[PDB]
DNA sequence: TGTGCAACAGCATGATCGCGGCAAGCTGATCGTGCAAAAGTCGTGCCAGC
RNA sequence: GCCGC
DNA sequence: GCTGGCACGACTTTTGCACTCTAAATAATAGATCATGCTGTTGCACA
């Protein structure tokens, strides 16, 4: 359980460093929304319409 | 990400290049296998699983 | 539309690299026609250019 | 020399240092290492003189 | 026996790159050992591991002109083979340079030649490269020879083919299931009576659909026979293995 | 964990078919063959510096002898005459007193390179290094009365003379392989002091197995059934591990469960764990537990970390039953720390005092233990 | 100094034997045994030598003439 | 008039898809065995220096 | 992930 | 007389030779785009 839990909570690719450059930087950051992941599609197999 | 259910498409109708739309069927579950169903351009029910 | 670009200047280049000039004059008769490029009734390019 | 000529480097840089200028060229080692990968294949590749 | 001078004699005048298949003699030349444990090295002294795919009898010294064991250690030496390890004393850059080979106690077939569209080795056979792959894994047998007995040169019977003709046939019936029917059957062909009696055929029938094939056979067995090759060479019974450093 | 350390820089190579490639790295005879280069020397001399520079250690002393250099060369009007000069060219390198014959070269090559006007350069030049170096290794009590000099500029002459590099050579060397213990076999203090076995990664790498080789078996696309491709790989390389894994663990338990003394209360409290009292405690060989415990770690809360360190197989004849030589050894360090300035610890005096303490020791096998880690305070 | 070579590329023109030629006279300038023929402005033995080109007291054929008589002198 | 041959459509597979630079980010090894053979070592007693 | 196209 | 590094007979350690012994579960979808070879289908000419 707690393997599991670090390995989605370290290591992944929604989980990254936030950008704290400016506070306006963090709140982009928090309100994202992101098409790729393990559910989502990669990057070469987007399209135009996509 | 795409939400579970059926979803309904054609293919944009340009696979055999004589001008025929091929319709599908596809049902996407939370978490399990696929299930399709396809068109071939003899017009006969094809079921692709997973 | 960038990668598509490189990879006709990638091919465009594997294919013309082996040409030098390697002489200086061949002594041949053979040519071409150049006319200017008219188009209908309107010209792009004159026989000068 | 200057990137992958493990002899070459150094003597350009003598010859540098003593103000010669030359770059007596030699072979780069990632050709050796071509050949060596080549040739652990089945495939048997040699340089005729 | 001094002032030798190794490193600049290695930069040697060539021209005209060749290329060409290595025969197992080749090969065993390049080899300055044979690899026979898949130990690189121990961590019970951390040392490169005897007769391993990082070893110090062969591949050459690990460190400077010192050998294993510290018998011989020192530029004083020269080429000098200690008794306790067949380690050499030497520069140790030879790690970059000597092969090592192993032996594959079994034919295998290699991939650059049987799994291409215009497989060489299928084509050569001109049998289909479905046939190839069933036969290379021991899927079904390929008899060879048999002439006394119905049993055509290139036969595909399967295993229940195959007991068939032992109940009947018994003898005179030569069947191998492996790589080694191939290069066996391979070994067997006569290049120059068959090239020419494709070419005798090409030339009293013409169609446009056999042309190309009839061409493409014509030309694949005139380059094996005008540049020396070996069509058993594709199969492999020995295997070159990679210097450690790279 | 109440604290976590940032992690250790790392490197892996990124866009290049061999991956992590590597990383060439300077080191003593590498920046001393680089000086070589870009000095003039002819032919014959570049190739003598090369021999003398192979010769360098890593303290950057010279190992072999002058005379076994000039027979390496093996070529004539190559005597020791024209080896010194080349040796004393590169001598005077950037890590100055490289490639010494010894101790005294060294300062000598050292203190050669001064301003000449230095207040006690000439003092020490030669009076201190190049004669009565035994003496200054002493008190040298004497040594004003032999140098017709007052203790007063001796005071600061040695001063000087330490002032001069040790060991030179040793400065330009990196020292990146800090060789770190990864600790195999954690340790901990309870009731009964249990241990337990870390690192395994047997699970890791079950699962790895699993999801690659047992992953494409189940994988339907390929024709038939991988069961005995891979899938009857894994469960080898499994068993293999977990083998391993229980072979140590039991191992490290009989040493616990034997060494427990040690752990409690004071730590040279070891019995002479033989190869044999282990090999019956296992039901085992005791080659293949010997193996086994030759470089595995422990991690101690004050316990060294080393598993070969309880064997002591030190009988030593003592009084009452047997005793351990390393447990001998040290009662003998702590005995010969705790003395008088004076501080005799003669070999038959500590003998005798352990004889005293129970543990019957000949007078000459004291004097090996004392050799082993130290020096005699003045005892002869 | 000399921005632009032309006067040099004109003097033998092909814009690639110049930068050779040059080399030559360049080497032999700075190697040894060789002085300027042209007065020096405390500048390269490059330009030296493109300037002596350009002045039109340096070409191929002097550089093997010159060799020539060298080689028959010693 | 039934039959054998050559040309063609459909499908499956393979190969290819720009160039530089900066971050942050990290993989393990296994037997085992008993056995003598060999090497190596420890407790002990030597003779030479102070 | 970002920068210059 | 006192002291400090060299050898010797048991014991101890190392080392090749040596043959070992399940159901789960993970992803597809979402790049097209082009070239080539294999196989089944059909039009054409023959005895
Ligand atoms: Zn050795």
């Known amino acids: ?50 | 990400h795409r939400s579970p259910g059926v979803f309904f498409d054609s293919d944009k109708g340009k696979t055999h290049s004589s001008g025929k739309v091929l319709y599908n069927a596809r049902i996407i579950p939370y978490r399990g296998s696929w299930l399709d169903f396809e068109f071939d351009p003899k017009d006969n029910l094809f079921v692709r699983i997973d | 539309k960038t990668a598509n670009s490189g990879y006709l200047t990638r091919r465009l280049v594997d294919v013309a690299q082996d040409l030098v000039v390697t002489e200086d004059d061949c002594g041949t008769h053979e040519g071409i026609m150049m006319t200017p490029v008219i188009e209908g009734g309107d010209v792009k390019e004159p026989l000068r250019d | 020399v200057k990137s992958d000529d493990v002899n070459g480097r150094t003597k350009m840089y003598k010859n540098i240092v003593d103000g010669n200028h030359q770059m007596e060229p030699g072979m780069p080692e990632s050709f050796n290492v071509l050949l060596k990968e080549i040739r652990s294949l089945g495939i048997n590749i040699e340089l005729e003189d | 026996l001094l002032k030798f001078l190794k490193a600049q004699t290695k930069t040697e005048e060539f021209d005209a790159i060749k290329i060409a298949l290595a025969s197992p003699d080749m090969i065993r030349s390049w080899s300055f050992g044979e690899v026979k444990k898949p130990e690189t090295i121990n961590y019970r002294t951390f040392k490169p591991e005897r007769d391993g795919l990082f070893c110090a009898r062969i591949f050459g010294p690990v460190k400077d002109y010192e050998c294993l064991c510290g018998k011989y250690k020192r530029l004083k030496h020269r080429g000098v083979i200690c008794e306790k390890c067949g380690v050499e004393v030497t520069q140790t850059k030879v790690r970059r340079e000597r092969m090592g080979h192993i032996e594959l106690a079994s034919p295998t077939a290699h991939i650059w030649f049987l799994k291409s569209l215009p497989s060489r080795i299928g084509l050569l056979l001109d049998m289909p490269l479905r046939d190839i792959e069933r036969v290379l894994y021991f899927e079904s047998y390929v008899v060879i020879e048999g002439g006394m007995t119905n049993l055509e040169r290139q036969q595909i019977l399967t295993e229940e083919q195959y007991l068939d003709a032992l109940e009947e046939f018994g003898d005179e019936f030569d069947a191998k299931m492996g790589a080694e029917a191939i290069q066996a059957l391979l070994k067997s062909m006569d290049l120059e009576q068959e090239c020419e009696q494709l070419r005798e055929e090409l030339n009293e029938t013409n169609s446009e659909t056999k042309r190309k094939k009839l061409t493409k056979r014509i030309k694949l067995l005139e380059a094996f026979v005008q540049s020396g090759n070996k069509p058993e060479w594709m199969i492999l019974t020995v295997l070159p293995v990679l210097p450690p450093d790279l | 964990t109440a604290g976590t350390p940032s992690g250790n820089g790392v490197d892996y190579q990124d866009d290049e078919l061999p991956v992590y490639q590597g990383e060439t790295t300077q080191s003593l005879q590498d920046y001393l063959m680089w000086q070589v280069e870009l000095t003039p020397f002819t032919d014959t001399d570049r190739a003598i510096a090369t021999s003398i520079v192979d010769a360098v250690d890593d303290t950057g002393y010279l190992t072999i002898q002058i005379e076994d250099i000039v027979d390496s060369i093996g070529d004539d009007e190559i005597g020791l005459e024209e080896v010194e000069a080349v040796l004393k060219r590169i001598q005077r390198f950037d890590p100055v007193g490289v490639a010494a014959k010894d101790l005294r070269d060294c300062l000598l090559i050292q203190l050669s390179q001064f301003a000449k006007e230095t207040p006690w350069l000439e003092e020490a030049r030669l009076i201190i290094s190049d004669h009565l170096d035994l003496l200054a290794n002493h008190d040298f009590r004497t040594l004003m009365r032999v140098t017709r000099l007052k203790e007063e500029v001796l005071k600061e002459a040695v001063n000087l003379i330490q002032s001069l590099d040790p060991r030179p050579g040793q400065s330009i060397q990196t020292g990146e392989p800090e060789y770190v213990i990864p600790d195999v076999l954690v340790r901990k203090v309870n009731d009964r002091w249990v241990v337990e076995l870390n690192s395994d990664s047997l699970p890791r790498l079950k699962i790895n197995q699993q999801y690659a080789a047992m992953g494409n078996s189940a994988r339907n696309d390929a024709d038939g059934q991988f069961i005995r491709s891979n899938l009857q790989e894994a469960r080898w390389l499994i068993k293999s591990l977990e083998s391993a894994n229980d072979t140590l663990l039991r191992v490290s338990r009989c040493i616990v469960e034997q060494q427990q003394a040690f752990f409690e209360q004071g730590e040279e409290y070891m019995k002479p764990m033989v190869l044999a009292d282990i090999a019956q405690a296992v039901e085992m060989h005791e080659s293949t537990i010997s193996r086994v415990t030759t470089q595995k770690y422990l991690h101690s809360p004050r316990g060294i970390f080393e598993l070969k360190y309880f064997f002591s197989s030190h009988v030593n004849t003592e009084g009452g039953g047997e005793a351990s030589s390393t447990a001998i050894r040290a009662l003998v360090k702590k005995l010969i720390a705790a003395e008088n300035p004076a501080k005799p610890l003669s070999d038959s005096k500590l003998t005798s005092m352990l004889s005293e303490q129970g543990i019957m020791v000949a007078r000459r096998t004291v004097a090996k233990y004392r050799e082993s880690l130290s020096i005699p305070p003045s005892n002869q | 100094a000399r921005v632009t070579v032309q006067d040099a590329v004109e003097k033998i023109g092909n814009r690639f034997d110049l930068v050779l030629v040059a080399a030559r006279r360049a080497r032999q300038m700075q190697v040894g045994g060789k002085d300027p023929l042209v007065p020096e402005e405390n500048d390269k033995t490059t330009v030296i030598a493109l300037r002596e080109i350009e002045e039109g007291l340096i070409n191929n054929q002097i550089l093997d003439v010159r060799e020539r008589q060298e080689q028959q002198e010693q």
């Open chain 1, 1 to 50: 359980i707690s393997a599991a839990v670090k390995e989605f909570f370290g290591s992944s690719q929604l989980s990254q460093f936030m950008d704290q450059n400016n506070p306006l930087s963090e709140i982009t950051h928090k309100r994202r929304i992101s098409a790729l992941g393990p559910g989502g599609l990669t990057r070469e197999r987007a399209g135009f319409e996509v």
